[PDB]
């Protein structure tokens, strides 16, 4: 069972774990055979081990992530808009993706797809 | 192939046709075999006929559609956040979905899914 509020709670927990750099808190939100496709059009990482290495490498740089709009949640699915900022040696970068989570009966995320492209990667001078 | 610029333009075309009541301008965006699942979870309308029939009814009440954020486009896929305002019995309603379009090689829309739930429906006048 996945009510709109549980799915929203998971998204917030997710954003908070990213900010915290809590690698195990992120992975604990995924099902054992869950898939991650980040960004869309890339070979999908399947399972806990692959999911974990993916985030371990992403967390190499401290992230600052923010939800920019209400979470859309319906029928075991949720989609949200957010921003991920991080500096890279004087270079501040802001990525603006839209993620899509698919949940399972247990309330764990079974699929994650992060949709962003060159046009969503911003970052200054 | 599908460039970000194209996919983004299709979305902007879509929102315009929708604002104008331009049914055929919308049906033209899809492929002969395209599918629509609006909302996510409901039975998906397949093919131009079913898609036409679906949009013909949705348009019964003149819509005021607006893009609330930048389009996310990458690898034959695009997702965008927006609002659909209208009235029905003196009451104003604002639906805030996040759409997901998948394009074919020809640049046409083969799949569309609308993700919004009770939480994204506001009487916000
Ligand atoms: C990988 C990344 C850091 C994390 C991250 C990115 C893009 C989309 C994401 C979506 C997520 O749900 C979680 C993390 C990211 C950035 C792409 C460029 C970069 O440095
Ligand atoms: C169906 C609808 C009119 C059209 C519409 C809605 C919601 C999401 C949409 C997403 C689209 O991409 C195109 C049209 C709609 C409204 C839900 C309530 C309503 O009257």
Curated annotation (Swiss-Prot), chains A, B:
Molecular function as annotated in GO: steroid Delta-isomerase activity
Mutation effect (residue 99 to A): Lowers activity 3000-fold
Keyword Transferase: no
Entry keyword annotation includes Isomerase: yes
CDD domains xrefs: ketosteroid_isomerase
Impact noted for substituting residue 39 to A: Perturbs active site geometry and lowers activity
Keyword list, A-Z: Isomerase, Lipid metabolism, Steroid metabolism
InterPro entries documented for this protein: Ketosteroid_isomerase, NTF2-like_dom_sf, SnoaL-like, Steroid_delta5-4_isomerase
Reaction(s) the record says it catalyses: a 3-oxo-Delta(5)-steroid = a 3-oxo-Delta(4)-steroid
TM annotation in the entry: none
GO biological process: steroid metabolic process
Top-level class of the enzyme under EC nomenclature: isomerase
Annotated catalytic residues: 14, 38
Induction description: By steroids.
Protein name: Steroid Delta-isomerase
Lineage: Bacteria, Pseudomonadati, Pseudomonadota, Betaproteobacteria, Burkholderiales
């Amino acid at each position: 069972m996945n009510t709109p509020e549980h799915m929203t709670a998971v998204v917030q927990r997710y954003v908070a774990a990213l900010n915290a750099g809590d690698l195990d808190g992120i992975v604990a939100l995924f099902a054992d055979d869950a898939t991650v496709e980040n960004p869309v059009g890339s070979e999908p990482r399947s399972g806990t081990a692959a999911i974990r290495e993916f985030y371990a490498n992403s967390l190499k740089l401290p992230l600052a992530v923010e939800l920019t709009q209400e979470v859309r949640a319906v029928a075991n699915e949720a989609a949200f808009a957010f921003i991920v900022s991080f500096e890279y040696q004087g270079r501040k970068t802001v990525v603006a993706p839209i993620d899509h989570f698919r949940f399972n009966g247990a309330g764990k995320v079974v699929s994650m797809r992060a949709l962003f492209g060159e046009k969503n990667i911003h970052a200054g001078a």
